[PDB]
C-alpha cells in the first residue's frame, strides 16, 4: 500500500498535468 500511495500521488500529478497540457474541459455542460 506504501507503493500504492506512491502510485496514487503520481496518478493525481499526471491527470492534473495532462488536463492543463491538453485542452481538457469538464465533461458536464449545463445548457440554459
Amino acid at each position: 500500500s506504501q507503493e500504492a500511495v506512491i502510485r496514487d500521488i503520481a496518478r493525481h500529478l499526471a491527470r492534473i498535468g495532462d488536463r492543463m497540457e491538453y485542452g481538457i474541459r469538464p465533461g458536464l455542460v449545463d445548457s440554459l
Binding site: R7, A10, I16, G17, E21
Partner: protein, 135 residues
Amino acid sequence: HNIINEILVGYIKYYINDISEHELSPYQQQIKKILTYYDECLNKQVTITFSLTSVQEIKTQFTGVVTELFKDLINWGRICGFIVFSAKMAKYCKDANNHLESTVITTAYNFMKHNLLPWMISHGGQEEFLAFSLH
C-alpha cells in the same frame, strides 16, 4: 545549471520560504503563476503527507512518485507536477526542521537533468514552458 534553477529550483526555494518573491528572476516570476495554480489545483483533490526521517527515504519515495509520473508520457504539464511535488516534499523537510530540504532539491535536480532535460530541450525548452504558463 540555470535552466534547472530557473524552471525548477527557484520555485522550490520560494515555496520553502528560503527566498522571497522578488528574488525570483523575471522568467521565474512568470512561470510561478502556473505552478501556484497547479499547487492549489492539486490541494483541491488530495492532501499529501510525509513521514521522512532520513536521506534514504527521500531518494526512494521521490523516485517512486516521479518515475511513475513519467513512466508513460512526458509533457510540460507533468513537469509542473514534478516541480510542485518536489516543492511540497521540500517544504515538509523545512517545517520538520530535519535539514534535508537540500537533499530533496538535489534529488529533483539530478532527476530533471538525467531523465527530463533532454526531452525539454527536444521540445522548445525554457521558452516553451513559459508559453505553457501563459495558457
